Design a protein around this ligand. Sequence first.
Ligand SMILES: [Mg+2]
Ligand SMILES: [Mg+2]
Ligand SMILES: [Mg+2]
Ligand SMILES: [Mg+2]
Ligand SMILES: [Mg+2]
Ligand SMILES: [Mg+2]
Ligand SMILES: [Mg+2]
Ligand SMILES: [Mg+2]
Ligand SMILES: [Mg+2]
Ligand SMILES: [Mg+2]
Ligand SMILES: [Mg+2]
Ligand SMILES: [Mg+2]
Ligand SMILES: [Mg+2]
Ligand SMILES: [Mg+2]
Ligand SMILES: [Mg+2]
Ligand SMILES: [Mg+2]
Ligand SMILES: [Mg+2]
Ligand SMILES: [Mg+2]
Ligand SMILES: [Mg+2]
Ligand SMILES: [Mg+2]
Ligand SMILES: [Mg+2]
Ligand SMILES: [Mg+2]
Ligand SMILES: [Mg+2]
Ligand SMILES: [Mg+2]
Ligand SMILES: [Mg+2]
Ligand SMILES: [Mg+2]
Ligand SMILES: [Mg+2]
Ligand SMILES: [Mg+2]
Ligand SMILES: [Mg+2]
Ligand SMILES: [Mg+2]
Ligand SMILES: [Mg+2]
Ligand SMILES: [Mg+2]
Ligand SMILES: [Mg+2]
Ligand SMILES: [Mg+2]
Ligand SMILES: [Mg+2]
Lengths: 100, 155, 54, 95, 210
Amino acid sequence: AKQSMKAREVKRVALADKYFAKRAELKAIISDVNASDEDRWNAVLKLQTLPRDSSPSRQRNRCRQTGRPHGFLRKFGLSRIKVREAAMRGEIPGLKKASW
Amino acid sequence: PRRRVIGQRKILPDPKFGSELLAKFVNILMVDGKKSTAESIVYSALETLAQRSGKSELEAFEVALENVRPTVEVKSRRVGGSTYQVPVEVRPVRRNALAMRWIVEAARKRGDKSMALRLANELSDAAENKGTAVKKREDVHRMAEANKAFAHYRW
Amino acid sequence: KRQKRDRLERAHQRGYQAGIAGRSKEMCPYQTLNQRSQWLGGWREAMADRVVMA
Amino acid sequence: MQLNITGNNVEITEALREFVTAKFAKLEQYFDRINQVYVVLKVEKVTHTSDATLHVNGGEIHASAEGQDMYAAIDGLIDKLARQLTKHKDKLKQH
Amino acid sequence: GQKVHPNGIRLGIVKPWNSTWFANTKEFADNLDSDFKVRQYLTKELAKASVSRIVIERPAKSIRVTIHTARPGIVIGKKGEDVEKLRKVVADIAGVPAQINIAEVRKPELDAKLVADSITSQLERRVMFRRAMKRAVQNAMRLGAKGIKVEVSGRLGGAEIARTEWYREGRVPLHTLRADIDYNTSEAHTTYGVIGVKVWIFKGEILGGM
RNA sequence: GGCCGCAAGGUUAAAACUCAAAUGAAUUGACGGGGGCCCGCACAAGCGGUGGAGCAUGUGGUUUAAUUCGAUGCAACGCGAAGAACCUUACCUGGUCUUGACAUCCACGGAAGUUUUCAGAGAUGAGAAUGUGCCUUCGGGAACCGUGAGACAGGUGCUGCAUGGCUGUCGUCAGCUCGUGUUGUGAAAUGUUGGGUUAAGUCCCGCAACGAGCGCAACCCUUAUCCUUUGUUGCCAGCGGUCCGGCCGGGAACUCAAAGGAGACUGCCAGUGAUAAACUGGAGGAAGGUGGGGAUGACGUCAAGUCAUCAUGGCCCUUACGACCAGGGCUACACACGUGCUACAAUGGCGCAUACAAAGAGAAGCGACCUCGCGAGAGCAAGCGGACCUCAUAAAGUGCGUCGUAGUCCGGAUUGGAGUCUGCAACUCGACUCCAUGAAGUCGGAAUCGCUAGUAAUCGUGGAUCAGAAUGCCACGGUGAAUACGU
Ligand SMILES: [Mg+2]
Ligand SMILES: [Mg+2]
Ligand SMILES: [Mg+2]
Ligand SMILES: [Mg+2]
Ligand SMILES: [Mg+2]
Ligand SMILES: [Mg+2]
Ligand SMILES: [Mg+2]
Ligand SMILES: [Mg+2]
Ligand SMILES: [Mg+2]
Ligand SMILES: [Mg+2]
Ligand SMILES: [Mg+2]
Ligand SMILES: [Mg+2]
Ligand SMILES: [Mg+2]
Ligand SMILES: [Mg+2]
Ligand SMILES: [Mg+2]
Ligand SMILES: [Mg+2]
Ligand SMILES: [Mg+2]
Ligand SMILES: [Mg+2]
Ligand SMILES: [Mg+2]
Ligand SMILES: [Mg+2]
Ligand SMILES: [Mg+2]
Ligand SMILES: [Mg+2]
Ligand SMILES: [Mg+2]
Ligand SMILES: [Mg+2]
Ligand SMILES: [Mg+2]
Ligand SMILES: [Mg+2]
Ligand SMILES: [Mg+2]
Ligand SMILES: [Mg+2]
Ligand SMILES: [Mg+2]
Ligand SMILES: [Mg+2]
Ligand SMILES: [Mg+2]
Ligand SMILES: [Mg+2]
Ligand SMILES: [Mg+2]
Ligand SMILES: [Mg+2]
Ligand SMILES: [Mg+2]
């Protein structure tokens, strides 16, 4: 991945978990049926204001070795490629080829 | 295949009439693994065969079976530009398989309401030399009779 | 598929087929006198049948 | 004979399309029962290449040829398939 | 065709893992990235210490790292000046208290990874690739390898076209699973581009999973 | 040109020009519409499909401001992508940036943060409030920020025909070789051929060969039977009690869980066979001759695939091929091809009633029970990092009723209206819900594919990716066939 692309993921994480609470509670009123029309309407304008890159849906799991955007695995935080490379050295405890 | 297939299977006999023969007949009618559905359809046909011939079931369904088994089939063989149809004996077990297949094939190709009706009617007609099933055997036999000259080739 | 066919029978039909197609005895690939007898046995039966074929 | 053209490192213009179609129309006289057929043109460095694959009535015939042009490549290719198609026909009309 | 990684296939059967801890999914990916970094660091700055393997355990909110070498002197230092430094700057990135050990490789010529680099070094110094390859297979068998194979590939002797050459002597049975075969690789960076090296060393067959 | 001949022609017999070869015998391969022998869903015997329809999806074409880049006979076309509204994103349009979004080095300034207003689509620009920290030995160094200079960073730019690494393929086919010896002037040959045998260069016997190595087989996982140990969150045979619910006290039998063992070796017995190797049959046994399934891929081939995973030789860009942002595009549609799903009905549709699985996932995640709603869902909130809690009621099946062979009570595409949920946000472009609508399709030309047993066929269940977005992919059980004469 382009250094830039790796970087955006850091800008995006950092924000996401700084405005995390602000978003949550500012959302919480939106979905409150039993609340002031005055309040909720304000909120809708207020959420859309604080920055896009601060949303958790905005980020993309990239291999934390090569930066790849595709073929990611959560258990290892690596791409299918780097998982295999490390598997075979025995740098992933337990993991090994399987048959049944 | 080029070698010999070892290990023939075991058909369990019918729950009712306790025949391996009829058990095969079910499998042949069976579709998409639905053995119970087929088990029903078969018995309800024999009921209605029994209820008209009045000649038992495992002894009536037989009489259909005899009117339709072939005794001589034709194999094809490419000779020059041409293809020789050649007559051959039929194995006992094979002529069972064919009779049971032709009966089923003839049944389905009818306009009656149930499957059970179609089978029943067909089995009845079989017993009186009538339906498509029995027509087919006649035709097979006609063809082997025609090109009898090629009876003894081994080629 | 699970087990090899009868070697004697096969040897007898290989004999027949070289026979009808008109190869010479002494093409026979067997020296095992047992299989050899089957091969020639076929080859000579076939020699009869060729006559009445065209 | 249904045709299909590819270009792997080549832009199929409307000579190279028109040309290739005309040249392939001959092949049916060698064997009447040709079905769909796929053509591929390549340029790797200096080598011009052209392969086609021909679904026929009981078979699959393939050949590839190299020219110094693509026209000369396709000219070569048509001579290769001709011979294969004739061979096929003759081992069916085998009486 | 392609061939299975001879280490990977024998992992449970007759080889150990290099990292041996346990973790739940929550911290599994995190221990991996942490480990990677420590190896990435150690190998970088022990380049010239002849290091074979970095086995690395996480016992209980900690990390002991036990790093095999055929030049322990150079790693240790003057009653352990360098080792403590490494310790200091591992705990730095492990994020936990760290401790380091030094295993001794007695026969550096019978170590797939060591010999692999041995060559890769020579090749970097414009040494003749056949000499490097030929020398290794001698050394190995001389010291009681039951077999040895070395492959080298790329633009050998700066050739405009790439090829792949390999010598074997002795037994190197890759299909036998209990067969302890030690395997490892090393890229060499000539001015023509990358020359890859691969090495297989058979030490004999084993009769017990252990 | 001469001579000979009735003629056909014979005989004698040049040159210009042009090529760097043309030829003989033998050698290794490859190939033959040559031969022999053995195999293979190769044919044959059979079962269900694809090609016709609607829809999903990939590709070609056209189109486009852009429709990002790659994969292309078998071995590209539900392929890289295990999941494109924004992001991703590499493309287009417009708006900006210039030692730079991402590092190290130096000087200078300022703790880092925190809270606000305005302009702007936003990037960004301009303000405003508050804050003055930790070792510092009396200079502050350590943060981490802002400005400045330039050594630099940066490039999913080009070449897979400069490469490493990884991968497909012939092919899990039974092959591929070497040392020494011997033969030949020599390329080479012998071994590796021959007789048998085998799934197998498998084994045996012969033999100018004697040996060895990579493969084959075995060692590994799984499944089938038994035994020992251990017994909760699993188990209930014998007892006693019961709110009749393993529910309770108990029990350690049984099922099951998982460590350790036992077991199959042609070992035992006939017949054949070169006193061999093996073969065919029999016994016992849960299992019989490689028991079933997986993992495992020889020397090599195809300048096969990947410079867009990463690395990397070279080449190129550097106030732009680098960097930021909003909106769009990858989802376009006269059309062609590939892979799928759902159908065309009665072995079936619809309604009520009622049985029997396996495997797997869950942490700020799986989310019961209760209340609300026709429904998607909503609110409230137990339990569970799990043989305990939750996802989560298997379906086909079965009984009873109905429809009665109709373009139908078959099909469910299309479209209007009305909603829900995820998410800054579902116009372009999400999934789902209710009401209405009710298309093509009556079993598919030439061609063509899969499969030999718990297989095909058919029925449900889970997972990876993942805010949301499967008819795809990877897994799991239920029911469960057909037929192999043969070459
Ligand atoms: Mg990079
Ligand atoms: Mg996302
Ligand atoms: Mg021409
Ligand atoms: Mg492989
Ligand atoms: Mg003259
Ligand atoms: Mg004259
Ligand atoms: Mg010659
Ligand atoms: Mg041949
Ligand atoms: Mg067939
Ligand atoms: Mg068919
Ligand atoms: Mg079509
Ligand atoms: Mg269609
Ligand atoms: Mg494309
Ligand atoms: Mg490219
Ligand atoms: Mg986008
Ligand atoms: Mg622009
Ligand atoms: Mg290549
Ligand atoms: Mg390419
Ligand atoms: Mg000599
Ligand atoms: Mg050979
Ligand atoms: Mg040889
Ligand atoms: Mg020879
Ligand atoms: Mg032999
Ligand atoms: Mg061997
Ligand atoms: Mg037996
Ligand atoms: Mg093996
Ligand atoms: Mg290429
Ligand atoms: Mg954008
Ligand atoms: Mg697409
Ligand atoms: Mg279907
Ligand atoms: Mg309906
Ligand atoms: Mg999930
Ligand atoms: Mg309700
Ligand atoms: Mg098979
Ligand atoms: Mg399914």
